[PDB]
């Protein structure tokens, strides 16, 4: 039936909205002060984008961003939430005396009916590596409700990519895989599964932070403009790259992070997940190469990061990289749905 159910396996959806149904999970996001306080700053400092305006909050969760919009003088805020968190949001709207201004609407933004078109859409639809969850697509879908020359908060998103060296990370993953190297595990030969094991462990993106000294080159930027993109733009995301290596050493994979910009009428406010910035609950993301690439300073490392949307609310990621000077290449598949959360 709906645009959402056509692109999403039911098993994925149930589990997804179950996770967000937990007050403990909403609290986790809320307690990220950089995230929550930057959203508040972006909204309050652009108060004229809200004052007496009609607002759509896509995936309101607790209601938190709708309360910021109300603090900035919005006339009416439609707060849409597909998880059972919608009922808790309703309770908060009542206890905060904002029933005249915040209207919770339970269900998927792809399935509900709003009573009118809006001036501005706000959301926090960013997953780790930006694209996990495929919630950006629901955010773009919601533009069917946006007035001409309406705005989006956030307005754009930049994904950054850079090559890294981290021998300790590589060996940590490699060591776990080599459990399946043993030819006599309790007298049983596991070694025929070595290859599948390495493949599975290296399909896992690594979510954690790190020092910027591990980066071997200036980062490449890929931009998505939410004011212009169509949902279909996010089905196949292709990020070519050419890195000018600043340091010699082994390239163990690519590091990703993302920034979003809230481009208001008064000022632009950035929310950054970069490793040079204060740490957020998104940390940063690294895709390891099963086979590291040796490169010399001044070499070029070129290739393509390709993200293919799947029905499990995430992406199949392929990264092909090569050192142009030697023709040394690494081909990699990663399953963005199945990360290794390594942070302590």
């Amino acid at each position: 039936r709906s645009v959402f159910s056509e692109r999403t396996e039911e098993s994925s959806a149930v589990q997804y909205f179950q996770f967000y149904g937990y007050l403990s999970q909403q609290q986790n996001m809320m307690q990220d002060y950089v995230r929550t306080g930057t959203y508040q700053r972006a909204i309050l400092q652009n108060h004229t984008d809200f004052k007496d305006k009609i607002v759509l909050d896509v995936g309101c969760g607790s209601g938190i961003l709708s309360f910021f919009a109300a603090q900035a003088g919005a006339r009416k805020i439609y707060a849409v939430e597909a998880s059972t968190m919608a009922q808790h949001a309703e309770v908060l709207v009542k206890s905060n005396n904002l029933t005249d201004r915040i209207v919770v609407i339970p269900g998927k933004v792809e399935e509900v009916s709003l009573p009118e078109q809006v001036d501005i859409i706000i959301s926090e639809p960013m997953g780790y590596m930006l694209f996990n969850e495929r919630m950006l697509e629901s955010y773009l879908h919601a533009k069917k409700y946006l007035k001409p020359s309406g705005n989006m908060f956030p307005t754009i998103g930049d994904v950054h990519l850079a090559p890294f060296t981290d021998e300790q990370l590589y060996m940590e993953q490699f060591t776990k895989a080599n459990f399946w190297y043993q030819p006599s595990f309790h007298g049983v030969d596991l070694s025929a599964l070595r290859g599948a094991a390495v493949d599975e462990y290296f399909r896992q993106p690594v979510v954690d932070t790190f020092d910027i000294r591990i980066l071997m080159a200036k980062s490449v930027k890929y931009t998505v403009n939410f004011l212009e993109a169509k949902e279909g733009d996010l089905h196949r995301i292709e990020i070519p790259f050419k890195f000018h290596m600043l340091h010699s050493g082994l390239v163990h994979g690519l590091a990703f992070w993302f920034d979003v910009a809230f481009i208001g009428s008064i000022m632009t406010v950035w929310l950054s997940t970069a490793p040079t910035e204060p740490l957020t609950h998104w940390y940063q993301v690294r895709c390891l190469f099963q086979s590291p690439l040796f490169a010399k300073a001044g070499d070029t490392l070129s290739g393509t990061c390709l993200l293919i949307a799947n029905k499990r609310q995430s992406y199949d990621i392929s990264i092909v990289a090569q050192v142009d000077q030697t023709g040394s290449k690494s081909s990699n598949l990663l399953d963005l749905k199945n990360p290794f959360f390594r942070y302590t």
Binding site: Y16, F19, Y20, M29, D32, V207, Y283, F341
Partner: peptide, 9 residues
């Protein structure tokens, strides 16, 4: 079913 990571202290 790990959707969002734990917020840092």
């Amino acid at each position: 079913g790990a959707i969002r990571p734990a917020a840092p202290r």
